[PDB]
Amino acid sequence: EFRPLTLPPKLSLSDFNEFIQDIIRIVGSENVEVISSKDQIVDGSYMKPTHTHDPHHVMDQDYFLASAIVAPRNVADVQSIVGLANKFSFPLWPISIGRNSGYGGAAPRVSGSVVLDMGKNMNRVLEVNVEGAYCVVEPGVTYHDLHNYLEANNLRDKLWLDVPDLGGGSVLGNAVERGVGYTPYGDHWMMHSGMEVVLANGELLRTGMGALPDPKRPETMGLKPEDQPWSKIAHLFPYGFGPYIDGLFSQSNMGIVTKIGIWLMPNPRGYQSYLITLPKDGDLKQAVDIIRPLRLGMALQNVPTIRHILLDAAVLGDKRSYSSRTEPLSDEELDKIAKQLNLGRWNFYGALYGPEPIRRVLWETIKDAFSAIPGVKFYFPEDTPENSVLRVRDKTMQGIPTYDELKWIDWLPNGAHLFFSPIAKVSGEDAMMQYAVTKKRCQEAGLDFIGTFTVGMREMHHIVCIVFNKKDLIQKRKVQWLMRTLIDDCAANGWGEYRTHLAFMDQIMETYNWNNSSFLRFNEVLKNAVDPNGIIAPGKSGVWPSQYSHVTWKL
Amino acid sequence: EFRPLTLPPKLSLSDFNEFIQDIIRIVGSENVEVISSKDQIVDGSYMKPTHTHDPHHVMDQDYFLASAIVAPRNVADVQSIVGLANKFSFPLWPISIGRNSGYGGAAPRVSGSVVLDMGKNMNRVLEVNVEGAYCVVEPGVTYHDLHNYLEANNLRDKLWLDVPDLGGGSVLGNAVERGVGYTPYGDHWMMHSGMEVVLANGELLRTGMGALPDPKRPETMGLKPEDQPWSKIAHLFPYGFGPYIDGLFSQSNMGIVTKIGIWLMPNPRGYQSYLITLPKDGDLKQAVDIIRPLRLGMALQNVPTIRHILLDAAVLGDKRSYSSRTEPLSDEELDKIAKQLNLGRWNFYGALYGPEPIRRVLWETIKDAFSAIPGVKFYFPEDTPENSVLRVRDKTMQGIPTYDELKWIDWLPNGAHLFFSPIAKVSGEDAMMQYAVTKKRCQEAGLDFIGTFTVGMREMHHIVCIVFNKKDLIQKRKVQWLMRTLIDDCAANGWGEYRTHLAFMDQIMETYNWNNSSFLRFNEVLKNAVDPNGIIAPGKSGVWPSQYSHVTWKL
Amino acid sequence: EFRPLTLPPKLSLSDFNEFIQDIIRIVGSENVEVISSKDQIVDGSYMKPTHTHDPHHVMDQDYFLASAIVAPRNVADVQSIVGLANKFSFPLWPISIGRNSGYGGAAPRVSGSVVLDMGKNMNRVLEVNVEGAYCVVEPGVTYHDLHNYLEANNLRDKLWLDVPDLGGGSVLGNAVERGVGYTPYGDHWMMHSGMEVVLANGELLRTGMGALPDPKRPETMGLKPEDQPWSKIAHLFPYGFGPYIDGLFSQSNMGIVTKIGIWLMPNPRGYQSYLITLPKDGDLKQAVDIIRPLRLGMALQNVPTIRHILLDAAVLGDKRSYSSRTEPLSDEELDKIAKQLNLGRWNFYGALYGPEPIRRVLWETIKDAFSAIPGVKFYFPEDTPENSVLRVRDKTMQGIPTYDELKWIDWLPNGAHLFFSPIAKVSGEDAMMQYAVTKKRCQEAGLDFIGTFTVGMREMHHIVCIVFNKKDLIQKRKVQWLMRTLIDDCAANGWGEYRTHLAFMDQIMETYNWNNSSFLRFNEVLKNAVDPNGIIAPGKSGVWPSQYSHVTWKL
Ligand SMILES: *Cc1cc2c(cc1C)nc1c(=O)[nH]c(=O)nc-1n2C[C@H](O)[C@H](O)[C@H](O)COP(=O)(O)OP(=O)(O)OC[C@H]1O[C@@H](n2cnc3c(N)ncnc32)[C@H](O)[C@@H]1O
Ligand SMILES: *Cc1cc2c(cc1C)nc1c(=O)[nH]c(=O)nc-1n2C[C@H](O)[C@H](O)[C@H](O)COP(=O)(O)OP(=O)(O)OC[C@H]1O[C@@H](n2cnc3c(N)ncnc32)[C@H](O)[C@@H]1O
Ligand SMILES: *Cc1cc2c(cc1C)nc1c(=O)[nH]c(=O)nc-1n2C[C@H](O)[C@H](O)[C@H](O)COP(=O)(O)OP(=O)(O)OC[C@H]1O[C@@H](n2cnc3c(N)ncnc32)[C@H](O)[C@@H]1O
């Protein structure tokens, strides 16, 4: 329609109208939804994600938000749209599925921007190669989707996924965000090979070997470039020749993604998932010094998770169902909890991979290792209650999608998530030292600390899990406050966040300040060169086209 | 001095003189060598690499070549020099050690360019972190150098390298080139985390977490930025936050490198190196279908090498010492050879890693697998002649540097190497099919095919090893001819070269043509944005600043 | 000469030489000193200030530093020089006298810059108007100089100065820096009216009424503009008409100053100086709540000083002469000290002004007020030891210059000063709260806190007096560390530094960050508009011309 609630910059309304008109004129009235009124107030459900904004909203609901939604039906649409977005300096905000909750979701950093709902149309599994062990997909291929495909093609016996805690995210969006999963193939971004992208100027690109063109043949003649098959090695060798640019494409506004090759993990013929429970909060420390060499030793296989009891607990029940108390729960209450549960204070989930002769020693290796930790306790799914999270993580650690996790998003009544994700070494000390802070602050903020550590190889992803009730302002402000505070400390102590929410992108990019913002500066430089017009989602990762004021924009 | 043999573009001589004057005025007369005359004709030795040009020269000796050599004494020097190089539009050609033989060596794509001999001064091991398992180095830290360091620090017991066939290359240059080595840590570029670079405009940058600044402290105050320590995670987590740009830094002219974090491989406590010999030339095919799933299965550990007999043979002796014949040796002569040697036609080198319970099954696994191949034969170093290459590769597969390889560079009298390095799937067929061609052509070119395959995980690096006598023109022309021919075919069949010589950069970047050179186009765009002046080694990877004509420049 | 140790940016050496040649060619070989070698290592004495760099150097000695010194002989010289500085993009660094010690002294933020020693030639008292009560001076009129003038003109009986703790600073440099003195006329910058400045483009300007041109007359015809007399009101009314721009001229690189009108304080016919001593460290708190309304009440007249015992003590003796101990002195040692001295822990100096009937009540007013503070004790100079600082401050509070202060610069052996100068409310609490921090940190830094508070009217200038031994690196680093730390806290708690050293300009301008650096941004904007070339002392107050990289430049 005619009158969206928010116009992007300097966009006049007739201009908005024309744009929106040429646009419906391409993609179909079907492919567009304007956002005419607050009857938008509608945040949604994981099952049916809203695109207009951030559901897990810490800011005012309407704070970051669409002017309109646009669902390109195919690459050329994106191309056309960019052209228009280019004609009018309308800005973009592409997304794949929108489950980017706890970071912003569908919500665009710049309000009045257009939402490029890619995945809606662009749902395809382009290919799944067994010999190469990989798949090629679109923004719309959600994981489950990816799964059922192999399923309805009996592939699971030949091949395997690597999911994140939840099943519905875009395999593609996730890889660009540098999302992480739990099988040894957990480092998603790194498992990519050959992607295609519509650059800021509308022109297509195929990274790496995506560039060595498939040789011609009758069969393939006359297909649009976005339609031509790929060279042999495209998807089996990420680097190509010359600059390795693919990275400009992750957590950046360099281009709009349309496709990507993700490598698949070949069924291993042997899979043992387990859980060593850690008794003392201080366990976390020895626990890590422990995992340290096993991870570097490869005795540890996939990316193992070290959980804080409440994550498990909260998956099991809301906060209220364990304490009808407003404040943070006492440290003694967790201990009751660990127990009511059989859990640890801390809880380490991992999985074994391979022929049994293989797993056996590994496991003799770990089990024997975790032994120095008193009250340590080991376990197979089997050995556990039928709602036990070890139950969920077994599927999880084998590429099977689930949706049991969100339940935890439920601790609080208008539970919403917000993730503080500082990186931390794999040193019990550092792990401890970082934890202290974050906690300390969750207390002051009046919160239940809840969070884990994704067991990186020489690093570790510290996911602080801040929930809070989205309908409680006193609180929302505390989170914001907590947010930016934790951001400073961590940094103050030397730790950066690896990915973050729309609302803190700036703050954190600011952490990245060596030599006077040089990194940021460099980015801008390339951003402008390539996106002179600032059309393609400006402000992401805290980077802005000249055209955007820092002052008018930052946060 | 005054009069170099070749001036870079539009550089007038007084201009050359001033530049060279302000320059000696910084780095010391010591740090500079002008190239006043053909008394330069001097190609050198691996032990003492020439910087002025390409030793393994296929082109006229003087074809690609310095105007002068400059050895920055420290980062600021590089900075200063860039500034001047910037003042005057003088162009750069940075290198670390120069052993880039078989690709160009020290030689600059653009003649009259200045040679930035980094490594000469910039020799330091900045750090070697055990807990993190990694080292931080300069352009000048050659591998051996890297080795002896750990050695003279008793580290080998805690940590391990990953060398390439030769010991003296720059750990750093090698990683940027995306060089590859043989331990499981063989994928060099990928083992990097945190690098620093002097951009085209003189400003410093530190990629990734290199950017999250180490927090302040008395101890560290007042040190130049190039001198400040790194944040904690800098070197344990390559991605940082926002765009993952590091890749603009590999096989590109985006910036000048000054430092880099390479992760180290923790001693594994168990190491078995071996060799299964392949009897028939056609073995190569089944051989691969074989390795295919073991590599994807991780039964295969490091990057294993599949050798062509002559590589081994030639390491053992020149060509003449096996046939006093000019032409390519008959296929029957190889067979005599395989035998005179105990070798296969093809020969697969690999290594086992870990506690023995660990290796045993693996090995039972491989050995049992290679079994379907008749006359197959397995072996430990022990089981072999004391000059046997299995002898050399054991050290090799454990990070120990050697220099036994070059000997092979000796097949021919004024042996020089030239590498054709097309990628190829891990399919016996493809492997075969690619081999056929390359060979076929080596024949026509009047050459001994010689080459291997670095066992990639879902790919394979096909290194065609073209030697030829550098002092034989009829021949040099045949190689050039062979070169560009093989380049077309491979491509014609769908295979790209992953890295190449100075003289073929263009040709190959041209292979990368999907959608009308889009990849190349994109590159230029960012290259100019960042290196408006085209000062920093123009033409690399076949990319050129506006300022350089395609026509005047390409090849 | 030929070869200065440091060239400014992109300046080539022949260029440096030409510049320096045309330049000697104007001002005389006499007016120039190149800085050819480290035989420069020479830091000097207050009596004979070095221009080349920072004497009180926290950084490496040579860290900030001249390329050459230039002493303009008259306004046109400055004009000429700018022109050249303009021709060549050579940068400027103007100074009046150089006693800007504890902030940088003569030292230029950008090394290789030229030092514009104004005051050397430009020594004149242009006028001293009795009727108007004001003087007009040049950069070279040091205070004492200003004094002796009135003296040798019997003026003191008619008029009075307002000095800062030391006598030799430039009356003019001091006013631009917003330096402060102790008579009621202590707010220096504010006592200005009509200034002249050579803008960045060489053109002259006269602020305010300086602009309403003196009407013509035979007597004045044909004099250069820099030579013409001023309009009547020029110097009696700072605002003029239209924009009140004078302020772009204080603690900014907007223009080069050549002259300025400072109003004079008419002898008051009655002057009583005194000192109430404060016993407890905690006294400082009640003490302030006390002064608060008297200052706002004008019962308090000039700007009174609240001293920390050690300042007085240190004026009396080095540190060693009270404790042969390296560490910070105990809090009990001060108490011995207060006593050995008759001093307070804290010590409040002020002065009475006017006809006696006038002073009497005031004093009855204060004395009676300070009474609630136990052990409080009052005093006239008379009532005190002949080296007593009350002795020095009496002259001080009456415009009489002295040089007794520096002695304190002597606490430490290679005593050097560094000033942390955060503003603080006039609330005992705030005063306390700010003090705590600063101290706390001086301890950790391993230092004697030493400092005061200039009794502002609704504010207070908290001068932390950091000394340290310039020849002790472990220490220098601690100060730097302390420096930037205190800067963050203060800010963290809401307090900004009002003026600072060369080395922290950036850091602090960064404190000034509301709305995303808007203030800084605005500044740059006007800076460039007016100093397109960045010639006029770039980086001051942390502001930089486009031409200067933040990254290359900041700190
Ligand atoms: C609530 C929650 C979230 C969560 C999690 C557990 C819970 C309970 N566990 C996660 C985990 O283990 N690992 C992980 O990486 N994330 C996890 N999250 C966060 C989130 O749910 C997932 O990461 C999810 O996969 C992210 O959302 P989705 O995959 O739906 O992606 P999106 O909203 O479409 O956005 C991706 C962002 O990247 C850029 N983008 C996306 N598509 C494109 C295209 N086509 N072109 C260019 N850029 C694209 C956009 O910036 C978009 O915002
Ligand atoms: C003759 C030969 C070569 C060879 C080999 C076996 C033989 C007998 N085996 C190799 C192997 O197993 N793996 C491999 O990657 N290479 C192998 N080669 C080739 C070569 O010897 C090595 O790769 C060698 O490490 C490369 O040379 P070196 O390491 O000395 O590097 P360089 O000449 O200095 O150049 C590196 C290139 O990259 C860019 N570069 C280098 N330093 C910088 C800095 N500081 N900043 C920016 N760019 C830099 C330049 O383009 C330079 O040309
Ligand atoms: C060591 C010390 C310092 C001190 C003090 C007590 C001691 C023991 N007490 C001070 C006090 O009570 N009040 C005060 O304001 N400062 C005090 N200080 C610091 C210092 O000694 C004095 O402030 C002194 O007056 C400053 O130095 P000086 O007056 O010699 O000025 P300068 O070095 O030439 O520099 C002035 C700065 O401002 C700009 N400037 C100067 N002249 C010009 C011209 N002509 N045009 C444009 N800008 C100019 C420059 O940036 C220069 O750096």
Tell me what you see in this structure:
Chains A, B, C: Its cofactor is FAD. This is part of a larger assembly, with three copies of chain A (555 residues). Chain A is α+β, with helices and mostly antiparallel strands and 555 residues long. Chain A folds into four domains: 1-123, Uridine Diphospho-n-acetylenolpyruvylglucosamine Reductase, domain 2; 124-146 and 160-210 and 230-266, Uridine Diphospho-n-acetylenolpyruvylglucosamine Reductase, domain 3, CATH 3.30.465.10; 271-501, Vanillyl-alcohol Oxidase, Chain A, domain 3; 502-554, Vanillyl-alcohol Oxidase, Chain A, domain 4 (Orthogonal Bundle). Helix content of chain A is 30%, strand content 17%. The first copy, chain A, contains 14 helices and 21 strands. In chain A, helix 10 runs antiparallel to helix 11 (473-492). The A-C interface holds A 515-518, 521, 550-551, 553-554 and C 515-518, 521, 549-554. Bound molecules: flavin-adenine dinucleotide (FAD) (3 copies). Residues 94-102, 118, 139, 164-166, 169-170, 173-174, 176-177, 179-180, 256-257, 405-406, 409, 417, 540 of chain A line the site of one flavin-adenine dinucleotide.
How are the elements arranged and paired?
This is part of a larger assembly, with three copies of chain A (555 residues).
Chain A lengths: L12 H15 L4 E3 L9 E2 L2 E2 L18 E3 L4 H14 L3 E4 L18 E4 L7 E5 L4 E4 L5 H9 L7 E2 L10 H7 L14 E8 L4 E3 L48 E9 L1 E2 L4 E8 L4 H15 L7 E4 H8 L14 H11 L4 E8 L2 H15 L6 E3 L9 H8 L18 E6 L2 E2 L3 H17 L6 E5 L4 E10 L3 H20 L12 H7 L2 H17 L19 H4 L2
Parallel strand pairs in A: 4-6, 5-6
Antiparallel strand pairs in A: 1-4, 2-3, 7-8, 8-12, 9-13, 10-11, 10-12, 14-16, 14-17, 15-16, 18-21, 19-21, 20-21
The complex binds flavin-adenine dinucleotide (3 copies).
